[PDB]
Amino acid sequence: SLQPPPQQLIVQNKTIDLPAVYQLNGGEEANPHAVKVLKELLSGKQSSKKGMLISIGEKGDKSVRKYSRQIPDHKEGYYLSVNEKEIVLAGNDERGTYYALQTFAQLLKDGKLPEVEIKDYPSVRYRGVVEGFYGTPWSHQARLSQLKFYGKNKMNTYIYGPKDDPYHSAPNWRLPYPDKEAAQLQELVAVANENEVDFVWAIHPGQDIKWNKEDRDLLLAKFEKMYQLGVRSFAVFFDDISGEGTNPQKQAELLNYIDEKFAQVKPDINQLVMCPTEYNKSWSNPNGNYLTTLGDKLNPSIQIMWTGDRVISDITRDGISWINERIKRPAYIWWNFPVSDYVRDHLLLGPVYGNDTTIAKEMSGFVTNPMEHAESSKIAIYSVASYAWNPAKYDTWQTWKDAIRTILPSAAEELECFAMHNSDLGPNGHGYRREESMDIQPAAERFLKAFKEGKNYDKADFETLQYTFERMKESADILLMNTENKPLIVEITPWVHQFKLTAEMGEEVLKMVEGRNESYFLRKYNHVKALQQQMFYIDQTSNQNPYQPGVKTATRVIKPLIDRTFATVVKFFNQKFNAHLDATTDYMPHKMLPLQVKANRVLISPVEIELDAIYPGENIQINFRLSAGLQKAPVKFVRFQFVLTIEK
Ligand SMILES: CCNC1=N[C@@H]2[C@@H](O)[C@H](O)[C@@H](CO)O[C@@H]2S1
Numbered sequence: 001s002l003q004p005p006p007q008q009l010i011v012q013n014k015t016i017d018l019p020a021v022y023q024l025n026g027g028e029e030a031n032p033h034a035v036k037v038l039k040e041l042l043s044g045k046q047s048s049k050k051g052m053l054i055s056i057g058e059k060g061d062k063s064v065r066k067y068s069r070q071i072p073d074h075k076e077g078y079y080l081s082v083n084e085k086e087i088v089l090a091g092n093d094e095r096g097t098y099y100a101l102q103t104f105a106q107l108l109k110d111g112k113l114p115e116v117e118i119k120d121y122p123s124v125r126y127r128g129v130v131e132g133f134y135g136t137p138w139s140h141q142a143r144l145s146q147l148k149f150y151g152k153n154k155m156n157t158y159i160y161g162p163k164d165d166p167y168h169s170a171p172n173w174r175l176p177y178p179d180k181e182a183a184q185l186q187e188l189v190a191v192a193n194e195n196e197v198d199f200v201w202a203i204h205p206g207q208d209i210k211w212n213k214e215d216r217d218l219l220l221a222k223f224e225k226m227y228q229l230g231v232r233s234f235a236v237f238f239d240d241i242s243g244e245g246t247n248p249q250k251q252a253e254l255l256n257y258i259d260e261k262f263a264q265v266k267p268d269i270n271q272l273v274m275c276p277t278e279y280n281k282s283w284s285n286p287n288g289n290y291l292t293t294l295g296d297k298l299n300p301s302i303q304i305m306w307t308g309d310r311v312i313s314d315i316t317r318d319g320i321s322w323i324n325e326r327i328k329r330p331a332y333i334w335w336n337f338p339v340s341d342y343v344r345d346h347l348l349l350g351p352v353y354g355n356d357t358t359i360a361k362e363m364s365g366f367v368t369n370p371m372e373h374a375e376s377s378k379i380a381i382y383s384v385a386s387y388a389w390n391p392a393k394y395d396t397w398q399t400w401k402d403a404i405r406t407i408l409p410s411a412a413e414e415l416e417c418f419a420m421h422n423s424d425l426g427p428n429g430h431g432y433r434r435e436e437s438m439d440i441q442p443a444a445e446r447f448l449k450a451f452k453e454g455k456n457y458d459k460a461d462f463e464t465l466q467y468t469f470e471r472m473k474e475s476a477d478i479l480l481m482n483t484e485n486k487p488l489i490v491e492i493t494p495w496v497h498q499f500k501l502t503a504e505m506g507e508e509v510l511k512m513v514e515g516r517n518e519s520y521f522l523r524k525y526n527h528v529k530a531l532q533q534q535m536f537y538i539d540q541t542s543n544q545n546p547y548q549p550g551v552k553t554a555t556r557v558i559k560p561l562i563d564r565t566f567a568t569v570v571k572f573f574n575q576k577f578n579a580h581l582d583a584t585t586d587y588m589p590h591k592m593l594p595l596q597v598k599a600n601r602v603l604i605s606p607v608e609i610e611l612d613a614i615y616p617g618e619n620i621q622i623n624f625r626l627s628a629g630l631q632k633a634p635v636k637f638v639r640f641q642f643v644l645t646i647e648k
């Protein structure tokens with residue numbers, strides 16, 4: 001499975017061996033980045049004036065003069081040919097030659113190559129990643145990894161703009177990077193250049209920018225410092241701000257100044273990009289002058305970013321026609337998936353889908369805003385690279401599978417199992433959801449429908465669920481121990497623990513449904529209770545961020561089914577045995593609508609609360625915004641949002 005799939009491919013059902021002895025033609029005149037790749041592939045072999053001809057070069061090179069007609073007349077285009085007599089790797093331009101090589105590397109398997117002819121080129125001009133999320137910025141080693149991933153997948157763009165980098169956003173956007181951070185950035189650029197990726201350095205000055213000379217010069221002085229570190233594409237971001245910095249006329253004037261006094265004055269600047277304050281349709285004023293002012297006043301070479309009809313949305317024909325009419329150019333898409341910075345307790349490891357596959361002509365660029373989990377984001381990133389290169393041939397599920405097998409070949413099926421039950425976002429203020437656990441959803445649905453109704457469930461459905469839980473535990477245990485991609489395993493570990501606990505709880509609950517006798521039922525019930533407590537422990541100790549602390553997994557279908565089945569069987573047991581077992585499904589150590597614990601807060605889900613111990617009280621916040629600082633007073637009982645903060 002070639003990824004991205006090429007525009008045109010003709011395969012002969014013949015394979016040839018990779019020439020053990022070969023004549024290379026054009027090694028001295030082709031893209032050195034492409035030639036490096038080729039010479040690594042041809043490692044172990046040796047060249048001569050004998051052997052298979054291999055021709056590498058860009059249109060215009062002597063090496064590829066016979067193939068000039070077959071080379072696509074497109075930026076980043078290439079012609080690739082393999083037959084018994086010779087190999088051709090001919091780019092329309094230097095980056096095209098590199099992309100030819102990236103396709104060639106995927107064709108090569110077990111020292112053999114298929115007989116193929118390929119004509120290829122991207123449908124979207126700029127394709128890549130914006131590191132543009134709130135939360136812990138990717139680590140240096142993670143970025144190094146990413147840039148290499150992008151080159152392999154023909155993504156040409158890496159926009160650097162972590163909202164939490166103080167030298168990117170306010171107030172320190174004015175300050176040059178300290179020496180250590182500067183030397184790292186410089187290495188990120190060298191690496192990007194070697195992989196044919198434009199490193200795009202963004203700045204985010206809008207929250208405290210003054211529309212005066214001092215700040216304009218400070219901004220240009222910063223761009224200059226970044227240029228000295230080797231940066232050659234630049235962006236100015238005005239997203240998620242208030243106040244003077246939201247002025248569309250001043251924004252355009254600043255971007256035009258940067259364009260005229262800096263971008264068009266240097267010998268070798270490439271992209272100049274801005275993101276607006278009104279960056280999706282819902283946050284745009286139909287009756288306001290913001291987007292029309294930007295569209296009219298911004299110089300036509302400047303790109304304008306857009307997230308769709310909502311902050312989190314997929315791109316539609318009608319959606320993009322709507323933006324393009326106002327900005328008078330094709331939107332450069334900022335796609336908010338798999339970014340999880342507003343559902344920080346979820347991993348979003350599902351396929352990439354939802355974007356119209358017929359609108360390449362209506363976009364200048366397509367970039368994904370990913371999770372703070374860099375390795376985990378590669379599933380979506382690989383799929384986005386495939387989508388933006390050849391949207392006409394984009395295959396959601398095949399590309400997801402390909403990505404997983406690329407990222408974790410040693411445990412691909414186990415990562416598939418984990419990813420397919422870790423795709424949805426749960427309820428959220430952005431209203432964006434993804435499908436999850438689709439395969440078992442019917443069997444789950446019928447089981448619970450019947451079971452809740454004294455109608456007898458299908459045996460095959462009970463077995464499907466059983467099989468699912470078994471497969472979940474195998475996957476969790478194997479992923480935990482996997483050392484092929486240690487950084488990936490580190491990222492997902494807390495969710496993996498939680499996913500295993502979930503599957504164990506599922507199995508125990510199914511044993512309760514079968515329930516041979518009263519004694520056995522009670523043992524399974526007590527085990528479930530202890531498993532609930534364990535999941536609570538994980539949720540309270542892992543991923544304790546300020547915003548959505550903890551660890552949620554398999555939330556759309558599997559956990560609800562388990563929880564509901566549990567409540568149901570406990571109800572039936574209590575009826576049958578005149579008992580009073582507690583049917584509640586989430587462990588809660590405090591007593592009182594469910595209570596919840598978030599960090600050092602104890603809250604009622606929006607009379608009297610009794611904590612498991614005496615704590616120093618911090619304050620209470622009630623909203624029917626009422627508040628009272630508790631001054632460290634010892635508290636166990638509180639009687640009257642409804643949130644209690646304690647020292648913990
Ligand atoms: C032109 C779009 N700019 C945007 N800025 C914010 C980002 O930093 C967040 O990561 C994203 C998802 O929460 O939400 C918005 S979209």
Ligand SMILES: [N+]
Pocket residue numbers: 029030031057058061
């Ligand atoms: N060349």
